[PDB]
Every structure is written in C-alpha cells, then in structure tokens.
Write a protein that binds this ligand. Sequence first.
Ligand SMILES: CS(=O)(=O)c1ccc(Br)cc1
Ligand SMILES: CS(=O)(=O)c1ccc(Br)cc1
Ligand SMILES: [Zn+2]
Ligand SMILES: [Zn+2]
Ligand SMILES: [Zn+2]
Ligand SMILES: [Zn+2]
Lengths: 69, 70
Amino acid sequence: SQQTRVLQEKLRKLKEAMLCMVCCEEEINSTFCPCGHTVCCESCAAQLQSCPVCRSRVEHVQHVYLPTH
Amino acid sequence: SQQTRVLQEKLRKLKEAMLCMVCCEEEINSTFCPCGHTVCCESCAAQLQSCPVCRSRVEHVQHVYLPTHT
Ligand SMILES: CS(=O)(=O)c1ccc(Br)cc1
Ligand SMILES: CS(=O)(=O)c1ccc(Br)cc1
Ligand SMILES: [Zn+2]
Ligand SMILES: [Zn+2]
Ligand SMILES: [Zn+2]
Ligand SMILES: [Zn+2]
C-alpha cells in the first residue's frame, strides 16, 4: 500500500542518520571530545582536527559502543 | 499489507534500541568513559560507579549529541 512506501522511507532515513556524515558509508561509532558531537565513523573522525558540526577543537576521539552496533 | 506490518516492527525495534537500558523511557545521550558503552540517559548514567555492561570503573560521563535524537 502507500503506507508500505511511507514506512520504507522512514526506515531509510533513520538508517541514514546512523551513517557517518562525512563518508556516508560507515556507521557512526566515534565522539569528538569535549564537544560531544557523535557524527562520524572512526576513519573520518581520526582525520579531523576540528568538529565538523560546531568547529570546536577535537582534544581526542572517544569510541562509542551503541546498542545498534 | 503484511509487508507494512513487517516494516512497522523493524522501525519499532530500532527506536526501542535508542532508549536508556535502565529506565527504558528516555533516549540514550551519555557515554561511560573510558569504556565507551553508550547505553543510558543522563539521569541514569549520573549515579553509576561502574559500567552496567562491562563493569569497568566510570571515570566520567561524556554527553553525546547524536543525529537520531528526537
Ligand atoms: C544505539 S542508539 O540507538 O542509542 C544510537 C543512537 C544514535 C546513533 Br547515530 C546510532 C545508534
Ligand atoms: C540539540 S540539537 O537538536 O541542536 C542537536 C545538535 C547536534 C546533533 Br548531532 C543532534 C542534535
Ligand atoms: Zn566516515
Ligand atoms: Zn562539536
Ligand atoms: Zn534512563
Ligand atoms: Zn562499559
């Protein structure tokens, strides 16, 4: 039905929100500290000196173990 | 259709995985450091001495801003 198409789109958007904002390919699993933005995979997060959301300096990256991982 | 019911179940399970493992009511938004388990809301994470998943000592809690927060 049309609701099948609507639910497929909601699922796709939720799954896309869980992917790295930079590479768009790998799951988010890293937090920029101290700001707390958690938007990248470990490979993209290792290469950024500044947070791509708020531009605060990245002091270090904390790996996050999330229930969806 | 039955396919709509299947998608509803997948969405519900994904949304439930985003909720605090202790209160089951609030969204996860806190990380136990240094272990990295990110399974609680700010209130439930605040008084835990050890990680509820791996038993590691909690040195501090890091707040996390996630793209899925609603
Ligand atoms: C494990 S969870 O459901 O808390 C979650 C939250 C945000 C992202 Br991005 C991925 C997983
Ligand atoms: C608190 S908010 O809605 O501005 C926000 C900011 C950054 C991310 Br990532 C998620 C949510
Ligand atoms: Zn990436
Ligand atoms: Zn930031
Ligand atoms: Zn809680
Ligand atoms: Zn832990």
